[PDB]
Every structure is written in C-alpha cells, then in structure tokens.
C-alpha cells in the first residue's frame, strides 16, 4: 500500500501530546450540556476579583481574623508597609491574585489596591499612602514619603481609595507604606480606634506564561 | 427609600449583587413536568434578627432547607421531592451613626464543611438548625461538629479570599443593606431540598463592631429571603 | 536571578484547558502473574476519582462544577519467559467487578478493555463524560441518603468508573511482578463556579476535613 | 515515503472499536436481502408493546397463571399495590418494559398502565385507582387515596382504564394502589368473583442510555 | 445512591447495532506445540455459533431472524525459545476439516487463514453473511430430516463455519502451551421478528430445553 | 484502515533529517520577537567585512 517510514519519536509516550485518543465507549452518547451559571473560561478571571489582604500578619495574629485589620488610632513610624509583589511576599502570596500567580513562573502586569476604611461615620482624618518604585529605598519619614509618589487620602470625604501599581513581574519590588498625615478626629460619642481593610486584584489586564507546580502543597 | 412588597409581606429597603450575572429563571417535556407555584412562596421570609456584639465571629445559614419551617415554601418541601428557587436575600443592619464595623455577606454555593476532629463525621444536626444560625468560633474547637473557626470558615480556605463568590460588603460607615440574587447553581436541573444544601449564606465580620459606653451593646442583623421562580415536580398523571 | 523586563501580553496558558489538561501519574500498583489462585494481589483496582493526589486535587477544587472527557495512557513494566500481554478493563459506574483474577466479569462484553502486549506503544483508552448530571461536582454539600443519614459529601453523580488490570497469561515458570502507572488527563474540559484555593493540608481522600492552619507566614511587625 | 509516527494506542486491541476489518472472503458475494416481515430497528420498539403484569405474585402463585389475575370480589384494605419502577420491583421487572430496561443503567421516561376488567358483562362496580408521587407515602385509607390523584373507574361503562405514570427513572418511587369504591353488583345469573388484568408499556417515548449486562442470567 | 433528575432524550444506544455489536470473548482453549504426533490437543476447533455463552445467547434470542457480518479478533498467549507464529484457519460451512495438526486440510486454498507471529497486534479476520437463506434463524421449529426424523430444532441455514487454530512451528525444545481467546462481534446487523426474553436458565448449548421457572420473585401479599 | 508498508529506513535515526519534532510544551506560547539591531541572515556577510591581516607574523 502506501509506503510510510517511521520517524524518530514513533511508539513513544510524550506526556504532553494532543493526539486523538480512541474512545472506549463509542456507542455511548453523553448527557446534554445545560446552562450552569458562572462559567470560567480563563484563570485570570479569578485574579481580577478583589479579596482581603492580611497586612497585619504579625507573629501571633495569623490564625485569627486580626490579620486582615490594620489598626488606625505616634506619627513618626508608618502604619503599615509591605513588598509589592504577589509572589515571595508574606502579605500578598495567599491572595486570590497571589495564589493564581504561584501556578506560573513568568507573569507580568499591574495590581490595584483598595483601602476600605472601616471606622465610624463620624471619624475624620488623613492618611498618606506612598509608593516607592522597585529600585528606590523606603521613606524613613513622612516628609520623604510626601516628596515621592503619594495620595493624601481624606477619610472624612471618601472611605475607599484605589491605587494601581505597575511594573509588577518576576521570572527588589515596590512598597506601599502608609502614614499619619493627621490623627483620627472623633466626636465624644464615636470610638477612637478604627480599622482599615485592604484589597488586591489585577488592575486592567495581567500577563502570565509558564505553568508550574505550586510550592504550598507538600 | 423603596417599600418593596411581595404577596402579603412588605419590607422597607434603602444596589443588587446579581449572583454570577444571571437572574433566576424557570427551567424552560411530558415525561417529567414541573409545577410552578408562583402563589405565595415568593413572599418575604424574615428570619430572626441576630445580635452582633464586639466578640461575634460570624454566622452561617444553609439553604434551601433553612426555610424548611417557613410557611408554604417550607410545606412544599415535604410534598414535592424535587425543586429549585432563586432566593433574593436582603441583609439590613440598622446600626446607629456612632457604631463602626464591616461585614462580608457571601453566599458560597456548595459549602462542604469539615469536621472539627478529623477521622470522623458530624451528626448532621451540626450543619443546620433550620431558622437559627450556627455561629463561627474565634479559635479551633474539638468534638463531633463543624470546624467553625474563622480564617478557615468551613471549607479549609482562607476567609479573606472568600470574596470570589456573590458577595456584598456592609460598611456601617457608608451603607447598611445588602441584597444578593442567587440563580440556583446546581449540576442537575432539579434536586431534593432536604439532602442537598444549594448554598450557605455566611455573614462574617471582618472589622469588629466598636462603640463607646453609651450606645447599645449590639447591632441586630436582619435577614430576609424571597424564594423566586420556585418550581417543583408534577404530582398529576399524564 | 535578577528582575528583568518581562514584556509580553498573553493569557493562552491561563485558560482552563491549558491549566487542567495535563497528564499526571495518579496510580502506581503491583500485580503478580502466578501463585495464590484466590488472591487480591494479582490485579489492580483504582476507582477513578479526581481526589487521588493532592497536587491535581487542588486544581480541581478551584472550580465547583466541571465536565471533561478523560484520556488515560498506562505505562506498564515488568520484573522477575514469553512475551507478556496485559488487560486493562474499564468498568463503567454500572458494572460488575471481578473478585479474583479468574472471575467471569473479565469476559463481560459491556466492560471495554484493551489487550496490550509488551514492547509496543503504551495503551491509550479514552472515556467520555459518564456522569448522570450535567457536570462533575468537586464539592457536594449534601447527604447521599435522604433524611440526613450517613455518608456526608459523597454524591453518586461524580462517579467515573473503575480500572481493573491483569495479565492475560494464565501462568509462568517463574514470578513476574508488573508495575502499572496510570496517566490521567482531563480533556475538552469546561468549568463553572470558581472557588477560593485550598489553604490547609489534606487529611483524607474522601472528605474535606482539615486542621486549622494559619492564613499566611508570619512576619515580625506590621511595618517591616 | 510518507513520514508517519505511531501514537500511544498503536498495536493495541481495544474491545470497543469500529475499524475496517479485512474481509476473509473477498471474492464471496453474500445472499441478496429479501423483505422479511417485522423488522426491529430500535430496542424501544419492544418496550412499547403491552404485556401482562403479574401483580398477584404472592408466595405460592408464581409458577401458575394465577400471578396475572387480580381477584376482585372488605373495603378497608386495598385490592393491590406495588412500586412503580420497572427495575428492582418484583411486579414490573420481568415485563417486556421491565426486561429491556435491565440491559441499561440510565433510563428515564413514562409508563402507561391498562387495567382490563375480565369479569362478566353484567357485573357492575367502581374501583378507585390512586397514584402516589415518588416522595409521598401510600394512602392508608380510601378517603386519603381520594384526596390525592385518582380515577374512579366505573366498570359497568368502560372495561379498560389507561394511566400514564410520569417521572420514572433510575441511575423511592410511585405507587398504583386500587380501592373498592363500590362492591361488584351482579345479577342472580352471573358469578360473583371477577378478575382484573394489568398491562404496562412505554407511554409516549422512553429514554435509555448506558448498556450493561443483565442480572438475571447467571 | 439517590434518585436524580435523569433528564435527557436519546435512543441511539437502543438501536440493534448499538445493542448486539459488542465484542465478547466466546472461546478459550489450550493447544500444545510438540509431542503426541497423533493427538487432538495440538489444535483448537470452536464451531462458530451464537449459542456459545448464555449472556450473548440471550441477546440473540430477542429476535427470531437476524443477519450480520462477524469480525472476530483472536488474543493469543503462550507459556512454557524462538519467536512463535500461529495459524487461525477459518473453514466455511462447506469445507474440509483437519484430523491432526499435520493434516493436508491446513494447506487448502479455499480455507482462508491468518499467520500471526507473536508480538504484533492481534489478528483480525472478518467473515461475511455466509448463510444460504436470507437470515440466520435463532429458533427453528422444524426437523432437519424430512418426515419428522431426529435432530429437532437444528437447521443447516444458520451454519457459520469453524475456526481451526494451530502453531505453524513444527517442533520446540521444550513444551509451549498457547491460549487463544476468540472475540466474536456482530457487524452490520439487522434483526427481524422480536421475541420475548428468556425466563428460564439454559440447560444445553444445542437445544431450548428448560426447567419450569417461576415468573417473578415472590412477595408476601398482593398489597405490601 | 489505510494499508501502509514500511520502507527500508523506518525506525532509524538519521542524524541529518528535517522531520516534525513533537513539541514537548504545546500549551506554551513563546516570547514575541522584538527587533534587535544587526541581524545575520548568511555567513558570507561576515567574510565581506575587512579585517587586519598579520603579514609580519615572523617567529617572535
């Protein structure tokens, strides 16, 4: 019949191939597909969902829900500060963003952060959210944070300030520090100490290349 | 202020999170024919109000059978062994202006929860107490019951990234009301309403309640469920 | 390593078929050829489920509902003769199982089986979407027996079958101990209802029970 | 010649394949097909044929033809009662319906029942045929059967009443009970005790998926 | 298990070709290679008929008349040398049969035979609709010899042939005992005149004789 | 199926062949090609470049 000749690679089993498998049950006709709500067609649709970031993950507050709460209410040291990279960072590694990025080796994109102030409706103050570029050093003072990139976030007007941090990739990252511009001003009835929740997702669109096994599972 | 009414139940409300971008709908065969009650069933079933103190870790309800004693909807569960519904869920908080706090109101379809001491199971009355909610706990617990520690809500996941589901934040600084519409997520078009818990409404306080020594020591959370587009199997011959 | 300009724009590797559809070894087992005419060590079983090893199990728990064809390719070895021929019998969810290597179930016409002789390419058998429902459920918050009886969390919709494997050679002069490695692969996979990733380690292969684990790794202060 | 490479699955023998078998007798030309009456082109054409259902299959009446006869002619206990599922039910498992359904694991459809009254042409009475839904409990009395689904089948007018029971599938079923609404009224010449035959088939169309081996053969 | 909503509409698995056309093992047999030059244990026979095993026999008795091509694939093993070559000789209904492993019938040009050497894919031989009539008859209410002689129920129209199998190797230093498994499969099957299913168990492979069996399993009362 | 017959030269490994190698990472999409200055498309573009010739290559 047809003269064929087997190339190198015949009668082998490459694990990652896409050949036509001979079906064991050919007569069998499978169940018709109904419409089920909430289809996922791409993994990066999970990374675009905001989720609470455990910024206050200090040594004794990680098995409770005090990990998610940033205590607000000393103006010389910042409120919080963390590396801005969803991989290899204790704060952003178990986020929905940071967990769908540990399945991959090459990823690059931007990341948006939402700071929801969960204090009273009468508490009023200012917080200064500074961003350091990936090469720069952290601000040691509030003035040195003001001279860089910042957003003086008035709490009494808006209760949710949104960032969008670019240049986030791996294959020495940024910083999101936060400072007391003013103290929390509060009437006699409302409580003095408040909390700030944080969030993280993919800002506009996220690029991600090389799939691997996750490190968390043992 | 909008005063919604359904049947013989009127509530007073003050934006809707449509779960998975879909509004519940009917299933549309003479071999199997559904019955659409429409009458009653759709009215508002206000559960008992839940007091939220400074030390409350959370709550959960398991639907559809949380409404198993609620009127005609809880009575059609005993006569029909197949059904489906939509469950518009309003969650008010009616706190004051000096109270502070924040809630996660999330629905979590198919919340398979884990036992407190593994290598065994729980006696099935630990997942649900019909109308009343099972609270979470602040730390780990033992015994033949649900591992109800927050940070690992029920399923062994992180409680912070529980936002992937149909959710709504209730920040007492800004808002007080939440509303979620959950369009019957299941792998079979109709299922029994006593075996299978289609979703788990769990309300989890991220930022704890706080106030001073003059306010009321709690904030009552009011839960209201309206079963929409409920349809059942047929009881008549063909 | 150093931080480079990772400049490209692609999410083709993040789709569901390019995330789940990867062949992974899910079942090693030994089975002899001779001796002990009534023994359970002359064939393999492996009830097919996604909850086999925790690395794959974790990926299937990203999603509540998913449906997919499976296309497994066995890799069979031998130790210690003639040329050996094997039999990999897939029984459906409704199917009789053998109790011994010489049971009559092995001859059932409704159980498809491949007869692979040694030396050729590995045997490949593909199984369609069997389930009664419209998708396989990774999680089932419900009870198998009505009125809140035993067996929490186990539905019969996500039953995929079993995979009985034996030598077809009746006997041998010496002992031959064959080893099989089943390579499971989802195919034409769809997935619904995303779900947060697993945080705690796995305890048992038929339940969701866990030990309360910390959220993230701890650091010294909030500002360092 | 043509560079080919053998995939995994070459030189194997999958039992369920549909490959072109090389014909052993190629010269041989087979006998022409005449038209033979009564062709079957689908198995569910056998399930649609009515056949007598052994309702009276009590412990000593199964090797005779008293299994098929429902004795008619105490109004407090029903005449007969049986599970409405052609699989795993002693009454409906050896019917033409119930026997072509044991070759399969997944089947779903409806089933019609015909009650042929085989009494005299002068006997007159009423029977109340109640149907319970698959979740409901059986009626313990005649009134409780009347409040559900029923058909008061007048024997003196029509001698054959047809049902069509839906929601019949496996992968806890219905009930067809029958009650004395009235006794059998009979003139002095006709006999007092009568019989009722039953029948069963597929009502409109029947769905059936996964072929298996039958349990009956050993 | 639980009663689920089995919602779909399909009868493609209930057609005759999707009901009968399934390969089932119908003939295991041993045959040696050497010794006993005049012996009947050095080859296999298996007169081809549908009344081989009761599971398949039951399906062919759903229908009175049926016609179909058959496509059997043998699965040959060996125990205990060189590389072995086999011969599977199908003789038609009109065909000479061997009496010994070294008979001259094996060389008949009108008996098609496959020469399968060990290690390759299994040998497949396909046989068309041989019968003299227009269909194979599962049942024959009649007498072979005119005027009501012996041999009830056996017509010569539903004769399919025989299948003689041997080693082609003339001898061997040691003893080699080969095992063959013939996988019968109906193909392009049509069926006429449906027929009620078998109720009683089978007695013998050439007759319809039976023991009177009960209709269904008994229950306690008519109302329970 | 299709009746094929293997020619001499089947199942061998000729070192200099140009057959379609089965890719090990099929899902993987490689990095886009940017324009890098100074592409070589032929070796004889190196021979056309002048270069200094050591004519005075005496023993020391």
Numbering used by the authors:
A (entry chain C), D (entry chain C): 1 to 73, 78 to 175, 187 to 233
B (entry chain B): 13 to 26, 30 to 43, 48 to 257
C (entry chain A), E (entry chain A): 43 to 122, 132 to 275
F (entry chain C): 1 to 60
Authors' description from the paper:
The interactions of enteroviruses with receptors or exposure to acidic pH in endosomes induce conformational changes in virions into an activated state characterized by increased particle diameter, reduced contact areas between pentamers of capsid protein protomers, release of VP4 subunits from particles, and externalization of the N termini of VP1 subunits. Receptor binding or exposure to acidic pH induces the transformation of native virions into activated particles with reduced inter-pentamer interfaces. The conversion of echovirus 18 virions to activated particles occurred in <3 min after exposure to acidic pH at 37 °C, however some of the particles also released their RNA and aggregated. The inter-pentamer contacts of 11,000 Å2 in native echovirus 18 virion are reduced to 5400 Å2 in the activated particles. The weakening of the inter-pentamer contacts together with the changes in the genome organization, probably enable the opening of the activated particles for genome release. Comparing the cryo-EM images of native virions with activated particles of echovirus 18, as well as other enteroviruses, reveals that their genomic RNAs undergo conformational changes upon exposure to acidic pH. The changes in the charge distribution and putative release of the polyamines from virions may result in the observed changes in the genome structure and increased pressure on the capsid from the inside.
The capsid proteins VP1, VP2, VP3, and VP4 originating from a single polyprotein form a protomer, the basic building block of the icosahedral capsid. Here we show that the exit of the RNA from the particles of echoviruses 18 and 30 requires capsid opening and results in a loss of up to three adjacent capsid protein pentamers.
